[PDB]
């Protein structure tokens, strides 16, 4: 079992590393479209290593069910904790 706090860290130091998002803006009460406008790129960057962190494959309905980082972290902890 994982823990989505955890999984918060991770989430938030790769993001930084890659397109140097800030992991302090980026909280579980921070807005993905609304508020950082995730666009293609970091989506896209986050699907490769969130399918090789977890190892299973991400279906797009999901990303449009999305709408914030919290719903992030429980998504990943919900499929992951089985």
Request: hydrophobic share 40%; net charge negative.
């Amino acid at each position: 079992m994982l823990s989505q706090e955890q999984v918060l860290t991770k989430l938030r130091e790769w993001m930084e590393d890659l397109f140097e998002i800030e992991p302090e803006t980026v909280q579980l009460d921070s807005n993905l479209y609304s508020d950082l406008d995730v666009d293609s790129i970091d989506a896209v960057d986050l699907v490769v290593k969130i399918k090789e962190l977890t190892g299973k494959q991400v279906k797009p309905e999901d990303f449009k069910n999305v709408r914030t980082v919290l719903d992030v972290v429980t998504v990943i902890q919900n499929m992951t904790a089985e």
